Amino acid sequence: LGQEKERFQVLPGRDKMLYVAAQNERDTLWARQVLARGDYDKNARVINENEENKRISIWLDTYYPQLAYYRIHFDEPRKPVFWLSRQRNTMSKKELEVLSQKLRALMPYADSVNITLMDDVTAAGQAEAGLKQQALPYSRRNHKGGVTFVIQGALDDVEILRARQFVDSYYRTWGGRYVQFAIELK
Amino acid sequence: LGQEKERFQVLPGRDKMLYVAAQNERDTLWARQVLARGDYDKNARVINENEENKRISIWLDTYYPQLAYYRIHFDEPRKPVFWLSRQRNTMSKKELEVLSQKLRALMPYADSVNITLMDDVTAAGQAEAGLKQQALPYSRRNHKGGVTFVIQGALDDVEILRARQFVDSYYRTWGGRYVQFAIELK
Amino acid sequence: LGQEKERFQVLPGRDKMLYVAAQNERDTLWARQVLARGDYDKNARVINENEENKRISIWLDTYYPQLAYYRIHFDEPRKPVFWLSRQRNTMSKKELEVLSQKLRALMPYADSVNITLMDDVTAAGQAEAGLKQQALPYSRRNHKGGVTFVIQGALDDVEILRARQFVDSYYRTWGGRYVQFAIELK
């Protein structure tokens, strides 16, 4: 990979394909272009966290429709970590091993998929803390199966930016399936 | 290094790579350019305190998410010092040796990473003292898990500058994870 | 040194480097330029009191952070004198010999570094006397760990100049860590 060794990871697939793991969309596009140039399109794929999370969510929409979960993390791409709700889980260890097996089959570059339970109260508390940290007025509204944090009042361009970066960061960690943020409209 | 011996340090890595330690961003960019010219990009890396602190923080966000800490200092780059909260520490000596080991692995140029406990009350007091030194009006607001110092009133261009330099200096020493500064908006 | 024998001193270093001691910034710049011309940059350094005081202060900020001190004087550059607070000293003779040893190592051109205790009440009294000498109105404000002298009223261009020269002189002798001067704003 050369000077690109820090941006990308090449992983072997169970499907005999090669996977290039990228860190963002701009690297993903560029990497796909390089592939589409040397004609490796049929033999290699470029992956990223955001796309893979969307792709697996589609599959879950049809196979595990009532599933209470957060997000998959790929800090170690050969061993992704699937974050599930601790409070809202209904499945036994055996059923969770089945899910993990089916997730592995969907990600040919993954040795295994670890299912890890995450606390809902913690999920919402980390959202609150980040808003308190920036002395942002907000209302926490608890609904059935989620929480909305409504950010209130006017904010300057800097504060609008700093709040957007917090929100973006939160979603990258937790996904947008449980806690959501919104901006007050008056 | 020649006439550059005072700005940079060359350190060997456990990964067989060479590390050039720089003092600021402008030296870091220039040093990377020199490397990108002689084609040492694949064999040498340029490091600085600010970038390394951000890089390790990312890793801690996922592996030690509840960790109460300040900052890593590199006054001796082969032996960085990781400043942890004395009051908010929950880990035993053994758990702190584990952390230190994992920090070492992340910094191939470090012989060891020393974990040092720093007093929260001291952290906030040094922030206060620096504001008192400049006869700056401020409110200290104690929150849960932090302190905000809100600098009040109008200030002339010189005083705005001298307050920014204090704040910048404070953050370089302590990081921005516990004590924060803000400017009053009226 | 020739006609330059009165402006500069050449001192040998323990590090095998040669040190040129200069009296001001303009001589320091000029001396560095001469060196950067004959290619002695890698073998000789130019030093001055102001820069050396800043350089050692940085080191003390991290190694002796609570240290109550004034300034280092180089009237005899091979034997600098480090002025410490007599009232606010907490260290024993042994601890002060340790400090002196570490200061020596930081100044390869110094045979030894003498640590000398200076009286805080004397430090503030010399500030007062110099202001009384010029029939300057002022308020002495005693704070915790320092004194501010606030110079009051309007002054003509000559008096503004004479007060600036006193202040500049004071700081050169005592540093700016204990007594500070300020100008009243009305």
Closest CA to A126 of A83, A80, A67, A157: A83
Contact A15, A104 (CB under 8 A): no
Distance CA B98, CA B153 (A): 47
Residue A160 CA to residue A156 CA, distance in Å, equals 6
- Contacting residues of B for A132, CB less than 8 Å apart: 143-144
Q: DSSP states of chain B as a string?
A: -GGGTTT-EEEE-TTS-EEEE-SSHHHHHHHHHHHHHHT-TTTEEEE-HHHHHHHHHHHHHHHSTT--EEEEE-SSTTS-EEEEESSS----HHHHHHHHHHHHHH-TT-S--EEEEE-HHHHHHHHHHHHHHTT--EEEEEETTEEEEEE-S---HHHHHHHHHHHHHHHHHH-SSSEEEEE---
Question: How many Å apart are CA C175 and CA A95, to the nearest integer?
Answer: 72
Contacts of C186 by beta carbon, 8 Å cutoff, 6+ apart? none
* Chain C residues with CB-CB distance to B132 below 8 A: 143-144
Tokens standing for residue C73: 């004087």
Question: Left (φ > 0), alpha (ψ -120 to 50) or beta: where does A160 sit?
Answer: alpha
Q: Answer yes or no: are the C-beta atoms of B23 and B48 closer than 8 Å.
A: yes
CA B47 to chain centre: 13
Could you tell me which residues are beta bridge partners of residue C73? C81
Of B111, B105, B108, nearest to B16 (Cα)? B108
The dihedral built from the CA positions of residue C4, C5, C9 and C15, taken in this order, carries a sign that is: positive
Of the candidates B171, B178, B67, the one whose C-alpha atom is nearest the C-alpha of residue B119 is: B178
Q: Do chains C and A touch (3 or more CB pairs under 8 A)?
A: no
Place of tokens 């050969």: A78
Residue with the two structure tokens 């008096």: C159
A74, exposed or middle or buried, with CB in 10 Å at 0-12, 13-18, 19+? buried
Q: How far is C104 from chain B (nearest CA, A)?
A: 18
Contact between B42 and A2 using a beta-carbon 8 Å cutoff? yes
E-only strand ranges, chain C = 9-12, 18-21, 44-47, 69-73, 81-85, 114-118, 138-143, 146-151, 179-183
Please report the sign of the dihedral spanned by the C-alpha atoms of residue A159, residue A163, residue A164, residue A166: positive
H/E stretch holding A21 reads strand A18-21
For residue B150, the tally of other CB atoms under 10 A from its CB is 16
Cα gap B159→B136, rounded to integer Å: 9
The Cα A130–Cα A167 span in angstroms is 9
Q: How many angstroms separate the CA atoms of C159 and C177, rounded?
A: 25
Please give the Cα distance from A79 to A109 (Å, whole number). 9
User: Residue C183: CB partners within 8 Å, gap ≥ 6?
Assistant: C150, C151
Q: How far apart are CA A123 and CA A143, in angstroms?
A: 14
Cα(A85)–Cα(C145) distance, rounded to whole angstroms?
A: 54
Contact A5 B42 (CB under 8 A): yes
Q: Do residues C149 and C139 touch, judged by C-beta distance below 8 A?
A: yes
| Closest to A140 measured CA to CA, from A121, A158, A161 | A121
Contact (Cβ atoms closer than 8 angstroms) between residue A147 and residue A180: yes
Nearest to C14 by CA among C112, C81, C80, C89: C112
Taking CA atoms, what residue in B is nearest to A155? Answer: B185
How close B183 comes to chain A (CA, Å)? 12
Resolution, rounded to a tenth of an Å?
A: 6.4
Q: In chain B, which residues have their Cβ closer than 8 Å to the Cβ of A129?
A: 145
Between helix B49-63 and helix B93-106 the angle, nearest 10°, is: 130
Work out the end-to-end distance of chain C between its first and last CA atoms, rounded to an integer number of angstroms.
52
How many A-B residue pairs are in contact by the CB < 8 A criterion?
16
Residue B118 forms beta bridges with which residues? B85
Q: Which chain B residues are closer than 8 Å to C182 by Cβ? A: 135
Q: Are strands B18-21 and B9-12 parallel, antiparallel or unpaired?
A: antiparallel
Spatial CB neighbours of A77, under 8 Å, sequence gap ≥ 6: A9, A11, A19, A21, A47, A109, A110
**DSSP code for A170:** H
Task: Please give the structure tokens belonging to residue B165.
Answer: 């330099």
For residue A38, the surrounding DSSP H or E stretch is helix A25-38
Set of chain C residues whose Cβ sits within 8 Å of the Cβ of B135: 148, 182
Q: Tokens 């792709």 appear where?
A: A55
Distances (CA, A) of C84 to C12, C62, C98, C125, C177: 27, 17, 14, 17, 11
In this structure, are residues C62 and B73 in contact, taking their beta carbons and an 8 Å threshold? yes
- Alpha-carbon torsion, ordered B128, B130, B131, B134, to 10 deg: 150
Q: Judge contact between C120 and C147, C-beta under 8 A.
A: no
**Within 10 Å of residue C186's Cβ, how many Cβ atoms?**
5
Q: Please indicate the experimental technique that yielded this structure.
A: cryo-EM
> Which chains sit next to B, with 3 or more Cβ pairs under 8 A?
A, C
Q: Give the closest-approach CA distance of B57 to chain C in angstroms.
A: 22
Q: Which of C83, C143, C151 is nearest to C117 (CA)?
A: C83
Give the one of B3, B132, B133 whose C-beta lies nearest to C42's C-beta: B3
Give Rg (Cα) of chain C. Answer: 19
Q: How many CB atoms lie within 10 A of CB B76?
A: 13
- Joined tokens for residue B65: 């998410």
Among B99, B7, B4, which residue's Cα sits nearest to residue B56? B99
Q: What residue of B is the nearest CA neighbor of C39?
A: B3
Which residues of chain A lie closer than 8 angstroms to B62, CB-CB?
Answer: 73, 75
Residue of chain B nearest C181, judged by CA positions: B134
